[PDB]
Design a protein around this motif. Structure first.
Motif, PDB file in Angstrom:
ATOM      1  N   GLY A   1       0.803  -1.211   0.000  1.00  0.00           N
ATOM      2  CA  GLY A   1       0.000   0.000   0.000  1.00  0.00           C
ATOM      3  C   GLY A   1       0.838   1.265   0.000  1.00  0.00           C
ATOM      4  N   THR A   2       1.922   1.277   0.768  1.00  0.00           N
ATOM      5  CA  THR A   2       2.806   2.433   0.729  1.00  0.00           C
ATOM      6  C   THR A   2       3.530   2.505  -0.609  1.00  0.00           C
ATOM      7  OG1 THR A   2       3.116   2.051   3.087  1.00  0.00           O
ATOM      8  CG2 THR A   2       4.555   3.653   2.009  1.00  0.00           C
ATOM      9  N   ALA A   3       3.991   1.355  -1.116  1.00  0.00           N
ATOM     10  CA  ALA A   3       4.732   1.332  -2.376  1.00  0.00           C
ATOM     11  C   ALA A   3       3.897   1.885  -3.526  1.00  0.00           C
ATOM     12  CB  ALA A   3       5.189  -0.094  -2.691  1.00  0.00           C
ATOM     13  N   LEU A   4       2.585   1.645  -3.495  1.00  0.00           N
ATOM     14  CA  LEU A   4       1.660   2.016  -4.555  1.00  0.00           C
ATOM     15  C   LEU A   4       0.879   3.292  -4.239  1.00  0.00           C
ATOM     16  CD1 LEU A   4       0.322  -1.658  -4.904  1.00  0.00           C
ATOM     17  CD2 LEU A   4       1.619  -0.493  -6.689  1.00  0.00           C
ATOM     18  N   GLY A   5       1.104   3.908  -3.081  1.00  0.00           N
ATOM     19  CA  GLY A   5       0.298   5.061  -2.721  1.00  0.00           C
ATOM     20  C   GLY A   5      -1.188   4.774  -2.705  1.00  0.00           C
ATOM     21  N   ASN A   6      -1.569   3.545  -2.379  1.00  0.00           N
ATOM     22  CA  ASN A   6      -2.959   3.134  -2.252  1.00  0.00           C
ATOM     23  C   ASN A   6      -3.363   3.325  -0.792  1.00  0.00           C
ATOM     24  OD1 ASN A   6      -5.367   1.605  -1.987  1.00  0.00           O
ATOM     25  ND2 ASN A   6      -4.813   0.475  -3.869  1.00  0.00           N
ATOM     26  N   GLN A   7      -4.198   4.331  -0.519  1.00  0.00           N
ATOM     27  CA  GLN A   7      -4.569   4.622   0.864  1.00  0.00           C
ATOM     28  C   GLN A   7      -5.542   3.592   1.420  1.00  0.00           C
ATOM     29  OE1 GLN A   7      -3.317   7.046   3.014  1.00  0.00           O
ATOM     30  NE2 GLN A   7      -4.513   5.876   4.513  1.00  0.00           N
ATOM     31  N   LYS A   8      -6.342   2.961   0.550  1.00  0.00           N
ATOM     32  CA  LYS A   8      -7.290   1.943   0.997  1.00  0.00           C
ATOM     33  C   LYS A   8      -6.570   0.701   1.520  1.00  0.00           C
ATOM     34  CE  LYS A   8      -9.166  -1.003  -1.634  1.00  0.00           C
ATOM     35  NZ  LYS A   8      -9.686  -1.449  -2.953  1.00  0.00           N
ATOM     36  N   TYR A   9      -5.480   0.303   0.853  1.00  0.00           N
ATOM     37  CA  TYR A   9      -4.665  -0.810   1.331  1.00  0.00           C
ATOM     38  C   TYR A   9      -4.025  -0.500   2.677  1.00  0.00           C
ATOM     39  CZ  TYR A   9      -5.003  -2.957  -3.362  1.00  0.00           C
ATOM     40  OH  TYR A   9      -5.441  -3.538  -4.542  1.00  0.00           O
ATOM     41  N   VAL A  10      -3.586   0.742   2.879  1.00  0.00           N
ATOM     42  CA  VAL A  10      -2.895   1.089   4.113  1.00  0.00           C
ATOM     43  C   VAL A  10      -3.871   1.152   5.281  1.00  0.00           C
ATOM     44  CG1 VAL A  10      -1.568   2.894   5.285  1.00  0.00           C
ATOM     45  CG2 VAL A  10      -1.032   2.228   2.914  1.00  0.00           C
ATOM     46  N   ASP A  11      -5.058   1.733   5.053  1.00  0.00           N
ATOM     47  CA  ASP A  11      -6.080   1.799   6.098  1.00  0.00           C
ATOM     48  C   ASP A  11      -6.482   0.400   6.553  1.00  0.00           C
ATOM     49  OD1 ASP A  11      -6.086   4.610   6.067  1.00  0.00           O
ATOM     50  OD2 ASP A  11      -7.800   4.721   4.658  1.00  0.00           O
ATOM     51  N   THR A  12      -6.673  -0.518   5.602  1.00  0.00           N
ATOM     52  CA  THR A  12      -7.016  -1.894   5.957  1.00  0.00           C
ATOM     53  C   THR A  12      -5.887  -2.563   6.726  1.00  0.00           C
ATOM     54  OG1 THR A  12      -8.454  -2.113   4.041  1.00  0.00           O
ATOM     55  CG2 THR A  12      -7.627  -4.134   5.067  1.00  0.00           C
ATOM     56  N   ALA A  13      -4.637  -2.316   6.303  1.00  0.00           N
ATOM     57  CA  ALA A  13      -3.473  -2.810   7.030  1.00  0.00           C
ATOM     58  C   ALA A  13      -3.534  -2.412   8.495  1.00  0.00           C
ATOM     59  CB  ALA A  13      -2.177  -2.283   6.401  1.00  0.00           C
ATOM     60  N   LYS A  14      -3.841  -1.138   8.777  1.00  0.00           N
ATOM     61  CA  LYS A  14      -3.875  -0.681  10.162  1.00  0.00           C
ATOM     62  C   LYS A  14      -5.103  -1.208  10.896  1.00  0.00           C
ATOM     63  CE  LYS A  14      -1.339   3.673   9.409  1.00  0.00           C
ATOM     64  NZ  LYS A  14      -1.395   5.150   9.576  1.00  0.00           N
ATOM     65  N   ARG A  15      -6.208  -1.409  10.169  1.00  0.00           N
ATOM     66  CA  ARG A  15      -7.429  -1.939  10.768  1.00  0.00           C
ATOM     67  C   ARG A  15      -7.233  -3.377  11.231  1.00  0.00           C
ATOM     68  NH1 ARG A  15     -11.232  -1.696   6.645  1.00  0.00           N
ATOM     69  NH2 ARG A  15     -11.256   0.567   6.281  1.00  0.00           N
ATOM     70  N   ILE A  16      -6.656  -4.224  10.375  1.00  0.00           N
ATOM     71  CA  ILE A  16      -6.254  -5.569  10.787  1.00  0.00           C
ATOM     72  C   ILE A  16      -5.229  -5.490  11.913  1.00  0.00           C
ATOM     73  CG2 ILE A  16      -5.122  -7.709   9.996  1.00  0.00           C
ATOM     74  CD1 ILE A  16      -6.416  -7.079   7.183  1.00  0.00           C
ATOM     75  N   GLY A  17      -4.175  -4.698  11.721  1.00  0.00           N
ATOM     76  CA  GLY A  17      -3.242  -4.350  12.782  1.00  0.00           C
ATOM     77  C   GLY A  17      -2.374  -5.468  13.330  1.00  0.00           C
ATOM     78  N   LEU A  18      -1.378  -5.080  14.110  1.00  0.00           N
ATOM     79  CA  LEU A  18      -0.553  -5.991  14.878  1.00  0.00           C
ATOM     80  C   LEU A  18      -0.703  -5.636  16.354  1.00  0.00           C
ATOM     81  CD1 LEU A  18       2.577  -5.838  12.631  1.00  0.00           C
ATOM     82  CD2 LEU A  18       0.836  -7.637  12.647  1.00  0.00           C
ATOM     83  N   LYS A  19      -0.572  -6.634  17.228  1.00  0.00           N
ATOM     84  CA  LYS A  19      -0.718  -6.362  18.651  1.00  0.00           C
ATOM     85  C   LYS A  19       0.489  -5.574  19.131  1.00  0.00           C
ATOM     86  CE  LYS A  19      -1.349 -10.484  19.472  1.00  0.00           C
ATOM     87  NZ  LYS A  19      -1.623 -11.953  19.408  1.00  0.00           N
ATOM     88  N   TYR A  20       0.225  -4.489  19.870  1.00  0.00           N
ATOM     89  CA  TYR A  20       1.280  -3.562  20.277  1.00  0.00           C
ATOM     90  C   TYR A  20       2.407  -4.261  21.039  1.00  0.00           C
ATOM     91  CZ  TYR A  20       3.607   0.336  22.672  1.00  0.00           C
ATOM     92  OH  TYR A  20       4.538   1.215  23.166  1.00  0.00           O
ATOM     93  N   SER A  21       2.090  -5.274  21.839  1.00  0.00           N
ATOM     94  CA  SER A  21       3.116  -5.860  22.694  1.00  0.00           C
ATOM     95  C   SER A  21       3.654  -7.200  22.181  1.00  0.00           C
ATOM     96  CB  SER A  21       2.584  -6.002  24.125  1.00  0.00           C
ATOM     97  OG  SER A  21       1.331  -6.666  24.150  1.00  0.00           O
ATOM     98  N   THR A  22       3.231  -7.653  20.994  1.00  0.00           N
ATOM     99  CA  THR A  22       3.716  -8.936  20.497  1.00  0.00           C
ATOM    100  C   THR A  22       5.238  -8.972  20.501  1.00  0.00           C
ATOM    101  OG1 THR A  22       3.710 -10.516  18.688  1.00  0.00           O
ATOM    102  CG2 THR A  22       3.803  -8.185  18.100  1.00  0.00           C
TER     103      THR A  22
END
Lengths: 381, 381
Positions: B347-368
């Motif tokens: 998403g960053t490589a392609l400047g696709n904001q929809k891909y990046v928003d979904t990436a953050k929505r799925i997310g990673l656990k802060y303390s993993t």
């Protein structure tokens, strides 16, 4: 007529009989089994003591495994306490040597014990005896007669008894020891030590808090506990305890765990619901192999409320034909071949020719080395 | 500007910069990461030589694992030759200690090296160096620079290069060695030994028959081969070769694997088709982390046939939102969290904001404690 133990005795006696009468098809099948069993004669006997990480008792003779679905928590700095992911086996289980070693020992003793019963060749008793001696009764290598640390879970606060289900690995072997009695290799001194071990083991599973709680478990674990109980009691020749257990525990559990439509609701909530439905019926199948040797048919004997275990087979049969129609959670592919032995066992117990036909159509491979399939030449044709 | 290496250099430079300026949110996060990294400071360095069963060379310094989908044939007296069951991992893989040990080395060395880059604390370089020396260059404990017996298959007569894909578990560690150059613990003599190892490994993957064959693979293995290739070349500062590999191998390979609708037909025929489609893009993603540091964006540069990696992301995107909608064979459930880093990278490589928003929505656990998430504070809330 075969000694009482954990097997389809009707199939064993008929194999031994046709082998002794020199019938060609059985004789050739048994010779294939003899070439499969050769590796068990060479196999070094296994011991639970063959581990480095010691249980909290500091005693290597105590059996210890990890409970398969419990995983380290990545959001904790030490990963503790472990968290459960139903249906996803944590590969850490394999860091506990007895997990696979009890499976290997069980296969070796069961295979050698049955072939001794069928052929009379002392070489099979001698090898079976070596495995039994080392795993069970040796004052250094034998396992202590308890399941205290089976399926431990790191970080878990309360003691649990769910690990007891691991016992089915060696308890079939315990029961097959009865087939090598009278051999030259199984001495009276050998018999007394194992009898005493089995007596100590039966005491523990009936009186420890863990074994009591497992005897009251409300799902397939309660059925498997009794399946194991029956093997221990059958080895110890306590046929009246077998009648008591069947009527006071197995039949009530079957009456509670089967629903009116024949489904097993406790297994329907699992992530491998078709596996665990079948797993419950497998615990009934192994129990019935023993009880039906003393005249108790657990497929058709009702519980106090009129339910019979054949209802649960009826419910599952359409899905054994077509595992894809299963409409409940099943996060891994069901192994259809489990229905061969199961439908053959329940089919014959019920005179249900449709079940037996389907078992033979699903079939088993003639030259498979899977030691549980040894009695089932009837499914390999 | 960070040394060329196998990581998102933009995020890493961001973290180190904000760390040095004393930004609280990043300082809290690094302090967590340091707590997670303590176990690697204490951890005893692993060696491939820590196995009992040796490879056919009889050299414990040769890496050897079992190809994960190859099982004993029970219909054979010796189980030989093994047979394939796609997607079903044979637990026998865990009898080869370097299978899991190369993964544990990889996590420890990468984590320690990234923390040394971000924080400058010599204690992280010193421990990273200890793991690197032991795994790679030590004259008794270091692994030989080859993958000749990676994913061996018992009974298989032909030699195969499929095993090379295991290299990814330690070739990222090789890459981050660049981050501890200039430290006190990593001496010019350490660097030269590793440089020579890496040169030797590079010769083997480019010139051996197994390396040549694996560089020609037409599915995800071809992509992973080149992704691993880039880590080794970047570690050796061969930026001209990285361009050549990007332009003449990765992009043609990527273009030949994408179909007109953006699906990856080679991965669709697998029993874990959604896993393997994602696995294919993950190789491209790790390769692009290195190519984009020298101006080549693999997500948006089309191949000679007009196919562009973004078409493959586009086809898979709906099924990252709803994995249950996947309509090809998938005999285990798909780990949705894999989409987090993948969609953020593409998403960053392609400047696709929809891909990046979904990436953050799925997310990673802060303390993993999963070391590959260390750079992705942006996906952690």
């Amino acid at each position: 007529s075969a000694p009482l133990g954990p097997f389809n005795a009707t199939l064993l006696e008929q194999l031994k009989n046709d082998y002794q009468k020199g019938e060609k098809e059985v004789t050739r099948y048994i010779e294939l089994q003899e070439k499969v069993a050769e590796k068990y004669i060479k196999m070094t006997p296994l011991s639970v003591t063959a581990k480095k990480k010691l249980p909290p008792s500091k005693d290597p003779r105590d059996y210890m495994t990890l409970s398969p679905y419990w995983w380290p928590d990545s959001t904790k700095i030490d990963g503790l306490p472990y968290i459960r992911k139903d249906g996803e086996r944590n590969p850490e289980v394999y860091e506990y040597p007895e997990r696979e070693n009890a499976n290997r020992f069980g296969d070796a003793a069961y295979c050698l014990g049955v072939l001794y019963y069928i052929t009379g060749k002392e070489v099979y008793a001698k090898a079976c005896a070596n495995h039994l001696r080392t795993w069970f009764t040796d004052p250094k290598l034998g396992m202590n007669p308890n399941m205290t640390y089976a399926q431990a879970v790191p970080g878990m606060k309360k003691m649990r008894g769910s690990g007891f289900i691991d016992s089915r690995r060696f308890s079939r072997a315990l029961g097959v020891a009865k087939l090598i009695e009278g051999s030259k290799s199984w001495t009276p001194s050998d018999k007394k030590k194992l009898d005493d071990w089995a007596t100590a083991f039966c005491y523990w599973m009936e009186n420890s808090t863990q074994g009591q709680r497992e005897s009251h478990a409300a799902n397939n674990h309660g059925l498997w506990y009794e399946a194991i109980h029956l093997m221990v009691l059958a080895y110890l020749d306590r046929t009246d305890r077998i009648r008591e257990v069947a009527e006071q525990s197995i039949l009530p559990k079957m009456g509670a765990q089967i629903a009116d439509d024949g489904s097993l609701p406790q297994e329907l909530k699992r992530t491998l619901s078709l596996n665990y439905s079948t797993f419950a019926l497998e615990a009934l199948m192994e129990a019935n192999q023993i009880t039906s040797q003393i005249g108790i048919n657990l497929w058709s004997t009702p519980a106090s409320n009129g339910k019979v275990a054949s209802q649960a087979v009826d419910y599952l049969y359409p899905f054994y034909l077509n595992p894809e129609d299963w409409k409940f959670k099943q996060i891994k592919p069901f192994d259809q071949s489990r229905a061969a032995i199961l439908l053959y066992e329940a089919g014959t117990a019920l005179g249900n020719q449709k079940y037996v036909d389907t078992a033979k159509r699903i079939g088993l491979k003639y030259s498979t080395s899977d030691v549980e399939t040894i009695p089932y030449l009837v499914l390999k044709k």
